[PDB]
Paper text:
pmcAntibiotic resistance mediated by β-lactamase-producing bacteria has become one of the major threats to global health. This phenomenon has substantially reduced the efficacy of β-lactam drugs, which are the most commonly prescribed antibiotics worldwide. β-Lactamases (EC.3.5.2.6) are a group of enzymes that can hydrolyze the amide bond of the β-lactam ring, thus making the antibiotics inactive. Mutation of Ile105 to Arg in the β-lactamase [name] simultaneously enhances activity for carbenicillin and the ability to evade clavulanic acid inhibition.
The crystal structure of [name] [name] in complex with clavulanic acid revealed the trans-enamine adduct of the inhibitor bound to Ser70 (+155 Da), which is formed after decarboxylation and initial ring opening of the clavulanate. In this complex, residues 105, 130, and 166 are slightly shifted in the [name] enzyme compared to the resting state form. This is in line with the crystallographic observation that the short soaking of [name] protein crystals with clavulanate (∼10 min) did not yield detectable density for the adduct. However, we needed a Ki for [name] that is approximately five times higher than for wild-type, implying that the reduced sensitivity of this variant likely originates from diminished affinity for clavulanic acid, rather than enhanced hydrolysis.
Author numbering: 28 to 57, 59 to 83, 86 to 145, 145A, 145B, 145C, 145D, 146 to 238, ...
Write the structure that this text describes.
Amino acid sequence: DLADRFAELERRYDARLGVYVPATGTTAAIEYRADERFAFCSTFKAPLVAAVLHQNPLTHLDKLITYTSDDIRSRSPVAQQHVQTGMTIGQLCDAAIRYSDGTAANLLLADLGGPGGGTAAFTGYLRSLGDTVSRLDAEEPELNRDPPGDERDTTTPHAIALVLQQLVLGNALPPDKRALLTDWMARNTTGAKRIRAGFPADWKVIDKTGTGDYGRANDIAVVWSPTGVPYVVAVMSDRAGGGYDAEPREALLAEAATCVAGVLA
Ligand SMILES: *C(=O)/C=C\NCC(=O)CCO
Ligand SMILES: [Zn+2]
Ligand SMILES: [Zn+2]
Ligand SMILES: [Zn+2]
């Protein structure tokens, strides 16, 4: 069955794989280690942007945030281009989603909850969406590096899927703010080889990736069939047996997505 097929992916990639797709009117839920904890890595940046959108008027997107070169302690290809002069909230949202910029996400955390309270406030946003499981405890780059088995900085496939479902398909956000989030996800530069690679080209896909130590590679997505029927897909993985420097395997996620697409076709 589907569980056997997912188990074979795990054997071949020497990995742990988590998959969740919510039920619809006509399709059963797809669940594989869906309630096991996996590190968010950069997947948290999608609800983070949602939180910042939700709590502020649209004009807040043009609020200028200044920061220094020494605020960059993580891979930040956009934020480095604009040090000292700063970046608007909107620019930070774009960078955090489309490039997975680390400093951009930290600055958004500070905008949401202040310098000390950002990770709690982010977690609290998830709580407001009924997610009582996920937790963000550290910011970039530490959130990508927690040991296997540690609950800190983790979500579950099930939990993050339900969050993304409310954000993109539900009414957690007003239409205008929702459209900004979905648009940034649609124009991301990091996700072509993950869930997108498992769905035929006539399906629409928007996603947010994450990558971390211990071979961590995640992708969360909303997809629409050629006739507009939506599904939410969360795929999470690690290769912790290889140690902190284990290589991530994007193709594992593409394969998991292909399995899902096959069932939903
Ligand atoms: C989001 O996932 C942002 C950064 N992740 C850290 C990274 O890619 C390094 C993995 O070794
Ligand atoms: Zn079997
Ligand atoms: Zn569950
Ligand atoms: Zn603000």
